[PDB]
Amino acid sequence: GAPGGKSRRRRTAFTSEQLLELRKEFHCKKYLSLTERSQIAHALKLSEVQVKIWFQNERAKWKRIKAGNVS
Template sequence: MAPRPDPTRIPRRRTTFTVEQLYLLEMYFAQSQYVGCEERERLARILSLDEYQVKIWFQNRRIRMRREANK
């Protein structure tokens, strides 16, 4: 049986990135597919995002790149 969802838990909203944020993230990704802690902090400040959002974006972008390479 699947676990029951917690009725008190509020689901996290999906982050919608602006065109400018995506452009800058893609520019940084083209330079390096991995960002360190300090660079992630700096990027998050510049883009007005959480560090976690930047981290997850890079993870997802690497996965997408690998999928496209395997086609």
């Protein structure tokens, strides 16, 4: 449904705490290591998979904000 993309397609159930650390980390490291994901997982009560899915979903959402990439 809504075959388009580049939209505000909902969020996962992450609270503002769980959003805080994630968004801070995003401005530091372009990639977390395996053990690093386990830090940002435990720190937020989340699973190592919940965090992997968020970081990947953010890389795209933020890249679309880079206006001057029209070529």
